[PDB]
Amino acid sequence: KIKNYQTAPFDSRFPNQNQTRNCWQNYLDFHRCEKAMTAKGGDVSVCEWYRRVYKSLCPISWVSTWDDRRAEGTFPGKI
Amino acid sequence: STALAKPQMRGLLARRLRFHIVGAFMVSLGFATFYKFAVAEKRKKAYADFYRNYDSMKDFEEMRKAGIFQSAK
Amino acid sequence: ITAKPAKTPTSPKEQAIGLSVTFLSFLLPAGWVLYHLDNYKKS
Amino acid sequence: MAYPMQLGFQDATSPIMEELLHFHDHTLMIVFLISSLVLYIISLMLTTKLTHTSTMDAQEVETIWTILPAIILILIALPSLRILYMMDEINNPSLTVKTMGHQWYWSYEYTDYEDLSFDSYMIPTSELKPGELRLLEVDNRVVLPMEMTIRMLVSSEDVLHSWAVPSLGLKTDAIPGRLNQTTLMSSRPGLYYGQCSEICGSNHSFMPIVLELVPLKYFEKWSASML
Amino acid sequence: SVVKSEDYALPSYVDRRDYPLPDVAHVKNLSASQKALKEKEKASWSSLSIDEKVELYRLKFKESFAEMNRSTNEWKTVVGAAMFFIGFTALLLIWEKHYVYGPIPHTFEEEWVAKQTKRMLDMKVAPIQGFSAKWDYDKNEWKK
Amino acid sequence: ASAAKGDHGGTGARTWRFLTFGLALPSVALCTLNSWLHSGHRERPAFIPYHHLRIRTKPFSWGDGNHTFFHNPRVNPLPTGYEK
Amino acid sequence: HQTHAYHMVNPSPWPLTGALSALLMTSGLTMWFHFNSMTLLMIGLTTNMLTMYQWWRDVIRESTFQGHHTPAVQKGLRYGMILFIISEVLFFTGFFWAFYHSSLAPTPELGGCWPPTGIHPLNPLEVPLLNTSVLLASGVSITWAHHSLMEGDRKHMLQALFITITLGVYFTLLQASEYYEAPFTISDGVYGSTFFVATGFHGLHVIIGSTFLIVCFFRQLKFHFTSNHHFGFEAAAWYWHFVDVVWLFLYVSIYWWGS
Amino acid sequence: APDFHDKYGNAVLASGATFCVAVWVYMATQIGIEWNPSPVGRVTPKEWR
Amino acid sequence: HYEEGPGKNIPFSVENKWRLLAMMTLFFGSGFAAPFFIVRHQLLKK
Amino acid sequence: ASGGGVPTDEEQATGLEREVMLAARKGQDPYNILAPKATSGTKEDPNLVPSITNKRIVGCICEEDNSTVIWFWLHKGEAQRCPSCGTHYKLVPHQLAH
Amino acid sequence: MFINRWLFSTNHKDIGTLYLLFGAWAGMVGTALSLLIRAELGQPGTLLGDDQIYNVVVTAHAFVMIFFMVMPIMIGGFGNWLVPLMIGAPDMAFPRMNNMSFWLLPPSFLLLLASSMVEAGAGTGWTVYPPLAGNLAHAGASVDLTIFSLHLAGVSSILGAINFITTIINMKPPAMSQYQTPLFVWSVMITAVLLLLSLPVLAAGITMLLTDRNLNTTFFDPAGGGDPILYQHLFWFFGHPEVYILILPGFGMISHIVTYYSGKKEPFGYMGMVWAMMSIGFLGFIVWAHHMFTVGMDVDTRAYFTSATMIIAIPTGVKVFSWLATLHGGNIKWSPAMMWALGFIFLFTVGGLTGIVLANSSLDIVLHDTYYVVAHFHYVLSMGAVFAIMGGFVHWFPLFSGYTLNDTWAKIHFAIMFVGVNMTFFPQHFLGLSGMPRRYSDYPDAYTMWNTISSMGSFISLTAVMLMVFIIWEAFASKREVLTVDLTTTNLEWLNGCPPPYHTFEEPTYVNLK
Amino acid sequence: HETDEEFDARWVTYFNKPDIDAWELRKGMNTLVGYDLVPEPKIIDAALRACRRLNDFASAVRILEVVKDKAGPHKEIYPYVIQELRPTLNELGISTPEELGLDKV
Amino acid sequence: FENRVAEKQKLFQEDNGLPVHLKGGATDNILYRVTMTLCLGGTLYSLYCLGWASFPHK
Ligand code: HEA
Ligand code: HEA
Ligand SMILES: CCCCC/C=C\C/C=C/C/C=C\C/C=C\CCCC(=O)O[C@H](COC(=O)CCCCCCCCCCCCCCCCC)COP(=O)(O)OCCN
Ligand SMILES: CCCCCC/C=C\CCCCCCCCCC(=O)O[C@H](COC(=O)CCCCCCCCCCCCCCC)COP(=O)(O)OC[C@@H](O)CO
Ligand SMILES: CCCCCCCCCCO[C@@H]1O[C@H](CO)[C@@H](O[C@H]2O[C@H](CO)[C@@H](O)[C@H](O)[C@H]2O)[C@H](O)[C@H]1O
Ligand code: CUA
Ligand SMILES: [O-][O-]
Ligand SMILES: [Cu+2]
Ligand SMILES: [Mg+2]
Ligand code: NA
């Protein structure tokens, strides 16, 4: 519901050339959503919008490094 | 003989300065018109005439048939 | 400005010697290095 | 790309680059006119044996020589800042591509749908095919759809680099830890070249950028075949 | 006459058209005939000879304004010597070409440039003004 | 502010000695009581090898290269965790 | 014989020995960072100390013993010291700008927060607050020492100046103990970088200011200052107030607003 | 009393000009420098593919 | 005191113009040659 | 509260500092700390320029607020005039070692 | 006696002479490095090696020209010789500290040449940005030796700024207000306030670089939460004031030379000239991020730095129109120094105007990091600061030495250098507009005609530097001693004779109030 | 400021002062040649009569050359001014620079 | 302590032609030679260390 996704849309929260926090925020939102959904016995499909937007915006090495550090227990953001 | 007439004797530097600063001003307006036509307008008219009937698929098909692209044979 | 005539005048021939020695002092050592670049590069 | 003996900008491939060309013509005429006027006055001040060497009153003439330059700087700044804001305007891109600078090559990621990424290195001079351009061709070009608004996001995995394509009016630094965004929209198909624009060590001169702009259907098939 | 370094704090003589009457006479010491000439200048000047008048001028001043304002031929020596040393510079560039620089890349061979120029026309490099705009694609020749 | 104080005729040696013994050294004795009362070791947090801490891009020019200059074994873990 | 009031200084070797000490300190730090050796550095630190001692000794010989600091020479030395302190204020502005840049826009690697994840700041209400009462108190006692010297009272000047130095040494011992107790280090990312380089260069300035006050204490013990002429004490006091004001900015910015 | 310029000015001007032109024309044209002029009006394009 | 006057207020002698030419040649020529010898030194390492 | 023991300048200044301090008390200015005040500068009332030797440089600020100062040597002997405004100055040489 | 005079000096004229000798030697180092850049670029391909050796030569070329040639000659050489004489003072305020500002420079230059001798040099650009200049991409001692060379030159110049400001404020005749001091003394006073406030922020930035390289701090390393762009703000907070420090003493020597050789007693518009130098010094601290328009700053920031940088053209135009008004009506003397000053008025105006083009950030996205920036700054440095240094050197060489140059040789030297510099840099505007990047040891083939012309111009500029050395030898070899100098009533530095005695103004000037 | 006539009247006054001294004669001429004008014949006549009261024939010739110099490329001005002063030149026996051969370079 | 500044004023004003840095007596010359020797010695050693560091140590 709201597919035909092409790429991440303009986000008034992040209107400038530096888009580092956009990528970050969406990776956090995705993983937060996903932890909420896996817990309360719900569906990760509802987290999809964040997953698409972070995958669009974030460099593959940044997501790779953040996933390694969540596995390792050294990811410094709150999830 | 005839005597000589009294010439202007005062303000000769200032009078020269005024005459040529005006001259430079007239020349500067002349170059600005010239340049508006030879350069600025020329360029606006080159881009508008290029695009007026430009067919980007036609231009792509010519480049493709000439072999230039990696993604289109 | 005004000045006295030279106390030790440097004639045209003396100027050509000083100019030639000054030019050679800059050109010969750099010329030697640049002429031998290849010797240094593939060595 | 630049051609031999070129004097000015590469022809514009994007509407913003055309705007920059007409804004530079405006500014260059002013630059020409003031350096000419200064050279001319110099010549005028030096070509008379008339003299006036007593104290000269400065206040009147200093009004002219502060207000006429202030008015010229306003005449430069107004179209300058209109272009600055037009480039920044919101535009709804159709596609996002990332580029990461490395010593000494660029990688590209197109991850809106599938995980597509690759490296793009300069073709060495000894391997150029006949007719190809020394120091500018790469093995894997950045294929993109023509006539479409694209968001390019630029970063680095090592030292600074800078990702430039002069004929699209683009130069965005590639800084590790930072994701900078720019917009690209080519009005035409073709091949559009640029070169790394921040000193990055031994092969800074030898890590170029080649965009290949083609119709969307060809970009979509190319992207599928690069997975 | 003779100006000495140890006179630097004294009023001095200068010829410059903007300072016509300098602070001291050109000659201050007078011989017997010169003294008599300065006494004769106290009487009517119509009784001085042209020579005596010139001599009084040249005791007071060194050069006349025509002499101090004269042009010279020094521009010929400056321009000629500057062309010489600019010409000497080309010797240095001929030596560098011969001994320093190796062959340039193969991409400047005639056949490579002819093919490179066809490919630049095929990709319509600078098609609005700069490069392919100067080729006639209908006639297959450079625009005249 | 005039502060809560009062004095001024001239600001002389007698007044600045009154300020040193009647305000500034009592403030230092009060802050010394306060500090030397919340002292005593609070207990060290679990070690987590976060990559933005314990940076080592070049060995230090002293010691074994891996200890900071005023390394305290009780509270400063190495990149591999607390010392034995 | 001159007829102006300025000081023509005798030809001196200390500018050259001070320049060579700078070459030996910096080439010394490079041998220590890259060639595993402290030898050039301790030669440079030793010759820098010897130069500083003989140059300032000779300024005391020129002024207290030979009379060359007329009022116009002393007014020059006032401007010199004010301009010197302005240059040191702008050196610390660079380190404040680094700290605000890093803390106002904390990057993802820190957790996107300040203080970073994993950092546990000192409590600004414990030894940092005690250090702030100590350096404020020392600005009050060095003001008492200044007015005692202007009122000609040798015992009280020395009493107040000694109390000022005692508090400078108390701050430096307290700061050395908090460096050792602190659970983060200079290698703990940009929080430890900003905290130890900015408080560390401030601690260096407190040790330089306290040494300058100890020079004035011994000069006063030797009767060098008169009740109207004592620019070395005025300069040390202006320097000491600068060290106090830098600490107040460091305590508000890095220990309290940045915790 | 002619000075150096009066006596040698014409020869320095004529000799230096002659020399400078001859040696820059020789350098520009005779030693293999590649000026890389525009191909426009100069180069016959050739099949490359 | 120290010598005063033209040719005396300088740390090099101008008493003999040819010994001065040698000294000026050594002085300017060593600053101009040093970068070429540095380059040579960097090329001869690897 | 208070007590003594700090020397005064009267007691302990020496050298040039003491010379300046003792001349000031006399209202004298042998080390040129103050600007001299101009006379009317006529030939009957020239500005009197003290010197220890036979000539001293004068700077004349011809009118208040001029930014150009006119500099020349004034020699012992008959008064000289500023070459810009003509105001007169006369050298008064000698001694300073009391 | 020779060691006492020349190694233990406390005299402002001998310390000025030491600075002029050091700056002249550094100019020959800087000229050789410039010829190595243009030999690498004078035909397509590779001459010396890849970009690391090339950019070690570019980085050293800049540091030697700026910190070891222009600053020591303008501020240490002309400032020390001229400023005390132009205010009648008997020396600098701190004559012994002045000698340490000089003697810190040979060790700073030794550190710079050591940085190029060790490992593979510091191939970083004179801006020394990380992470290329950090310990992973430039491991080993070269970049730390460059840091410490800039720390020594920084302390020399901060100590020297304290000395000049104190001497100009405190040591004028008591009747002389600062609105009766000559323009060159104002230009050195304002340059020294810019050095005092800007060099400490460079010293903080480069010490942070030193600790990220050696103490495991992470001010500029994102892995620790640092930011490479914070180093660029700290360096350019100094680096924009630095270019005004390079040109302001030149503007003060151009005002004296144009006044003198126009036969005028004063420059046109003295209070305007003082206002324009203080306005340029103030505006020069609020514009630094015009060196960062492609780093990804917010749009409103980039609009502010475009506007605030363009504003500088207003005071600078007042100075250029006031130098033209000073020539107006003059009895013009076509001396070699006047030729250098009239070259400077026009060529500095051209370079300043291409600086205004670059201040428009939209256009600077396509011009940044290309040779259009290299053409702008060499018109204001090789044809601006250096033409003011050559004008001031041939105008004041007979004051410093007591001997005259040959004017015909000096005119020949000006004509050769004017052709060479223009040949070198004018075509770099075309290379910049058509996209050639900075810091490249080789270029795509289309850029070959203008790189060949620009390297031919650099060789003509080398012929002028060699001929300048022979001209200085011919003047000391011939010994034509000065007699009378014109206009001493408005040029106090000549009134003590040529050269002036070791001690001058031992009896101060007499200046009354009235 | 003032009219032309007022300016000329003050400079004729300055040079007509009977006891003008040599310094004032030089100060007057060297100041008057700073202005953007060639001085009127009436100013020149009073300066030449000051030279005669100061027994200085040579400075009278130099003031005639300064008039020619101030006129720059306006070659009509000097012959006019010499015409106007022919009766003072004949009365005082002042030869012009051309009659003395001093216009030869 | 007693005020002995007048004794030091007499010492440092003796008309003996000594520059100030040597005017205290034989101490000052020993401390000057120490400092100068360490400076010049240490500078020669820094130049030796640059020679060593300018070549690879394999
Ligand atoms: C002496 C050296 C010097 C001087 C004085 C200046 C002066 C100026 N500079 Fe320049 N500049 C450099 C040296 C200098 N520059 C250097 C070294 C760099 C490169 C740094 C690096 O990256 O290594 C550079 C880089 C640089 C940039 C960054 C470009 C980029 O990297 O992409 C910009 C941007 O705005 C700039 C602008 C200006 C301007 C507006 C001035 C103004 O001060 C000029 C003002 C002068 C005038 C305008 C001319 C006279 C005025 C008139 C006749 C009046 C009428 C004029 C108008 C109405 C316009 N300079
Ligand atoms: C004062 C500064 C200055 C000066 C004068 C010059 C002068 C020259 N420079 Fe420049 N240059 C820079 C500062 C300067 N440069 C800077 C800051 C950079 C950027 C570095 C970076 O990218 O990091 C640079 C970069 C630079 C490049 C771009 C390199 C690249 O991007 O890859 C080029 C290219 O041709 C170049 C060439 C030259 C040449 C041929 C000259 C010639 O004009 C030189 C000719 C010689 C002289 C001007 C004589 C010098 C002086 C004297 C001998 C003193 C005489 C002594 C007395 C009178 C007392 N320089
Ligand atoms: C107690 C308060 C007083 C501080 C003094 C103490 C010791 C060393 C002196 C340094 C003074 C100032 C700043 C220099 C940089 C860093 C030191 C910062 C202060 C400090 O001492 O930081 C310590 C680290 O020292 C380290 O790395 C130290 C490594 C020591 C080497 C220093 C390197 C030299 C730097 C060059 C400075 C250049 C100056 C340029 C001037 C500019 C010119 C105009 C902190 O210890 P830690 O174990 O990491 O953490 C505590 C964990 N329990
Ligand atoms: C680990 C520590 C080592 C590192 C280096 C520094 C170490 C400690 C140095 C402490 C500074 C001591 C300064 C002593 C100065 C003594 C001389 C002096 O004080 O001299 C006075 C003049 O002031 C003068 O020059 C004023 C002079 C001085 C400025 C001193 C300030 C600091 C300099 C510090 C270097 C800072 C480093 C910054 C690092 C980034 C003499 O004039 P009066 O006092 O009026 O006397 C005359 C009366 O007697 C007449 O009746
Ligand atoms: C950028 C600044 C430099 C610009 C150019 C300098 C112009 C160079 C001047 C000449 O330099 C000399 O050139 C000789 C060649 O002409 C070199 O001899 C070399 O070649 C000779 C001829 O092959 C052999 O006889 C010699 O042994 C061999 O050293 C010689 O070493 C070098 O000093
Ligand atoms: Cu990558 Cu330059
Ligand atoms: O810096 O312009
Ligand atoms: Cu700038
Ligand atoms: Mg850049
Ligand atoms: Na090359």
Ligand SMILES: [Zn+2]
């Ligand atoms: Zn006057």
